[PDB]
Symmetry: D2
Subunit: 389 residues, 4 copies
């Protein structure tokens, strides 16, 4: 029986996933995608490319209606009629949306054609994660839709400049993304919520802090950790959580509006909030770790170099710059780390960097790689520890 074999496949894959860890499960999920692409028919490939786009649009509609948050708190299955009346949606529109959502597990449909939350419905109800999907719809989609004709019109140039990429055609502006987004309210509110989505796991999973400290001393009043562009300060919070009695200042540096947003969730003491533009010289001198997580990936090498050069003069012999960012391999890179590369090229003019490309960039700033501590698999995120040359 085909159905019996399909059910047994699901049982065995679920059991294998449940027994391994998060990295093993991520490897299984990539394998399932690889198998799907290898087994689909030519017509299936075109159908998948035609229709998988609709998930983001329909997730946007569900978020506009508040469907996912409502469904995630319901204690019993709900009919399409009940959901439509409660959320203020046309009854047959609601039924068609739910049918589509159930077919891509954005909700679950029951045997009496009612609806309950799935793992994805819960995810889309979380404000920082819902903001990621809304960001894909309103910011990434227009840039991806502009890039084929941008490249055609310009005879397929190598994109190297944040002010000359697809973003400018998509949003009909001459400034780079970061400035243009400075001026748009709805954009900024969603961006704001995006900063609250903390990624797991983080570099402290694998970072051998005591080993990297060596005999460095916090006396008299030195800084252990300067989180440059630290956003809501998640790195600082987790550092103090895991090393609560390690001496030394822990300093969150960002722009004033972001630090004001961070105060609500920062600890009452132990973490300093210091306004600092990372395009200016670093004010904290001789810190042990100058930390840049998911900062440099957003800049082409000219601008990423200048961010590092503003830090290097503050370093003493024991100081390290810690770049925590994607480190895709030379070959066999996965879709999450090559898709990111196409999107940041499109929007920001920047790129993902292999380990060799990170080392070449850091060498231009007078820096040498001392250690690399991977903390995610199979997609590579790592804390790279750089010394003065």
């Amino acid at each position: 029986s085909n159905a019996e074999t399909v059910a047994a496949i699901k049982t065995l894959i679920q059991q294998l996933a449940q027994s391994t860890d998060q990295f093993g499960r991520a490897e299984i999920n990539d394998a399932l995608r690889e198998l799907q692409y290898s087994l689909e028919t030519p017509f299936d490939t075109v159908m998948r490319m035609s229709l998988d786009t609709a998930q983001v649009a329909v997730a946007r509609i569900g978020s506009d209606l508040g469907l996912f948050k409502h469904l995630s708190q319901c204690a019993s299955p709900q009919s399409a009629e009940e959901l439509a009346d409660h959320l203020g949606c046309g009854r047959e529109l609601m039924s068609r949306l739910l049918r589509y959502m159930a077919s891509v597990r954005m909700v679950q449909q029951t045997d009496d054609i009612k609806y309950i939350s799935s793992n994805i419905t819960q995810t889309l109800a979380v404000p920082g994660l819902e903001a990621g999907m809304r960001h894909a719809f309103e910011n990434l989609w227009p840039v991806l839709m502009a890039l084929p004709d941008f490249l055609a019109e310009r005879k397929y140039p190598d994109i190297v400049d944040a002010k000359d990429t697809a973003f400018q055609k998509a949003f009909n502006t001459d400034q780079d993304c970061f400035h243009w987004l400075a001026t748009q309210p709805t954009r900024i509110a969603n961006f704001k919520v995006l900063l609250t989505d903390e990624r797991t796991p983080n570099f402290l999973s694998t970072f051998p802090l005591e080993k990297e400290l060596g005999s460095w001393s916090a006396e008299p009043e030195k800084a252990l950790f300067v989180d440059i562009g630290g956003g809501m300060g998640h790195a600082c919070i987790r550092l103090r959580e895991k090393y609560p009695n390690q001496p030394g200042r822990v300093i969150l540096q960002d722009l004033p509006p972001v630090l004001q947003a961070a105060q609500a969730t920062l600890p009452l003491s132990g973490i300093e909030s210091m306004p600092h533009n990372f395009h200016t010289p670093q004010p904290v001198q001789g810190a042990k770790f100058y930390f840049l997580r998911l900062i440099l990936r957003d800049f082409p090498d000219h601008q990423a170099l200048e961010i590092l050069q503003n830090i290097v003069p503050a370093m003493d012999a024991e100081s390290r710059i810690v770049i925590d960012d994607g480190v895709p391999p030379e070959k066999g890179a996965r879709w999450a780390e090559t898709g990111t590369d196409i999107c940041i090229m499109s929007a920001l003019g920047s790129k993902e960097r292999t380990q060799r490309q990170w080392e070449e960039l850091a060498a231009k700033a007078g820096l040498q790689l001392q250690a690399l501590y991977q903390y995610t698999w199979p997609v590579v995120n790592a804390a790279m520890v750089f010394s003065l040359q």
Copy 2:
């Protein structure tokens, strides 16, 4: 070990797939997608929705460059630099595009970082399938992009009008989709290539022609089969191919430009090409089968009703209207027959219809369902045979 487990999963799924038939393989691929969605983390969900739409943009770039047809005819692996200089692409851009395409199997990367065609490469080199991908990019994506705000602005109506749906916002026009397309030369050219893609399997695999015919006589000059909106006439070709000695006229009906495009690939005898607009009265009287394949799905009930009412008066007691189209189930409908529903709502104001919905629509035309012959699984396509009430 993790790598060993993952490779073993792929070996076993590949072996199970190779041993079933096309419908079994489609069930396996549906299960692999559901497993992927159930096993992904919340961050995975957002990254998948953020990045999967980039595949359509990058397939459109590869199509613009001629990359897939070139790779498909290459006899050895090609370096990124060879492809870049052959195709007129910047070398760094080409390398980044190929890394991304290899990660989603749109090409294959070798272990010395050269590139060869995949199944997907070959698919995207086929003119009609390439055109389906290009249609997704240039026609489906803008309407999906406009749908959320269109729904919000209009307070979530039940869309029933081809001249009042998301299409009008997306392309800033008051025309309905079909009329507007007819004014756009590049778009109509790509649609004509799309008509050359023949779906498989087809209704003749399960349609019991002999039993439906009974003692039906073709004399003096009656038609056995009238293919209304038949495009390239693939249904007429396959009919004549399978039943070459069955008497009766076989008539392809479409608008003049499509009939002209069809002449190259039609048989020299046995199939008549008859210009006919299906919004006007059917000229062929008393035919055995009036055949509508993937036609009525593109019209709201009002207009689909009118198309049937243009045929009904031409029928005698033995005539049948055969609707060959999607018949999704009442529950558990699959993504390829619910995502279509959302797309055709947004572009055409139309919908997919369950069996009960087809029968209700046909009853307003004075017709009753005699038989239903499914020929695809698990996504339902069927030949629905209707007679006068």
Copy 3:
């Protein structure tokens, strides 16, 4: 490919096995055996029945030669010629024996045709497990060999008498098995080594000692636990190990030679060794638990009844008889608790007993079942707690 499929099956089963517990692994191994029997051809069936018994003969040869203990302590692979000359075996015979043992995993053959220990090699080097294999060869096989003609000659009786079953034909004696063994020195020596094999898990993993005890008081000198036929006293040892501060005498009862063999491995204090024949009245009065592990299974109902009737008069209202033994299900019983049934019918005139059969036997002794605490799965071993009626 066939080889690839086969290796993938083994990878996936090994991964599933490693992730469950011992009971899950036992269920998997039962399923593998049932799959093997359902998939074998008719000729396979006969070859399996023809050849699988050779493994006991060749394990007995390896034991005679000392091969398994020698291989288990070897630090590198050994050639057949090295093993032959070390162990005193003809070189061709040794090579043929090793080829056979490698094909059933009793050793492992390397790719340069040398030999190393397997899990099974290590098992057969353990004195008590070696003795179980030697017992199968010298005691179980002759009785199984005599059973078919014994049944035929006697017109298929229901065997109920330890002095009238297949044992008497197999060893050409009128004695019952236990008495005859006691006259055979080599056999009794191997049985004494067999007593050193401690089964795991044991009843204390699920026995709720505190709840069964209640407010039971040990003073002035009552016994908490009387281990009747306790062998090496493993139940007493594990009892004292798990509940070292529970007051009350713990008493191992067995015949003098077994108590003497037990002295080496008993604790120096806390467990009394008391010579007692369980076919005679129980000397310890009013103990909390009189414990019979794998005792009553070796006696037909008449004699098992007598053993219980020798204990009952020693009981007070708080005393319990704990029968720790196999409790096979009414249906779906597994091969390891039905093959035992056939063996003990043939050698001892005994039987395995379902829960209902245990309760019927205990009721003739005046006892009622209070509780049943299973501690192995899927083959059922349980501690059955009986009180006076």
Copy 4:
């Protein structure tokens, strides 16, 4: 759920088996056995070695009762009581036998504790296959039970002589097996039925007969095929079936009592029955193929050499000797071909031979290997074609 995972394992293994061919299924079955041995606990290993012997004894009882043939023709499940009364067996003995048989799939037990035939019950009802199991019980078992103490008493000699092996101790005789069996009636009747069990597949599956013929001519009256020790003549029957109009005599040679037994099932013409002792010179001169299937494996090299030397003088330049027999590999030999080696060493003093050992034996007879045509996998049976040197 453990049960759910176990059920899914069975479903997936059954589906993989059902889709491959008989050789793929034989590889899967060997893998399942390998997994069982690797996953069992030390106690399980001893239990399996103690109890798997009982299958042959209980199969013997079932055959004595006629249970398997009766159950194989029953049209509905039968209770233990019904079977006991019909077959003349004690009711509780019958119930215990059926419980054991169901646990090793020798029958199947239903959910209402009744019994139906399994694949193994059908196999054991077939007279030639039942005779193989009875042969294992009455002929192979006594020799395997004698071999450990035979080897111990004789200080582990290399066994090379049919008149000095374990057989002589097992059956208290000084003659080799073949003569001693000449004198025992029950033995001979069962042996007789054994000859009717035709193995599948056979060498004609893969033997390129037309290629091996070359330009050999049957004119005037030459023999195509001389089946030496051909038993019931199955090789001759299948040769004429697959090559019904190939010219040349086809001759079955055996001892007179076997050829009289073969007449009932030989074709009415086309196959000659010729009495011939293969220890005498071959009377048919210049045949194309002199065929020896499963003959030489039963003889030590001295006697196997003399059988070949009696054929060689009859050969002309185009004649071939075809040895069809087991050809185990140099390493990694499977249990069916190494267990056979131990049993024929025990009973007959002979051995399985690798390809190199066959070539060494044939070279002593003046013969050279021309071709080897395997026809079973993974256990190697092959037709080896030898020429004059």
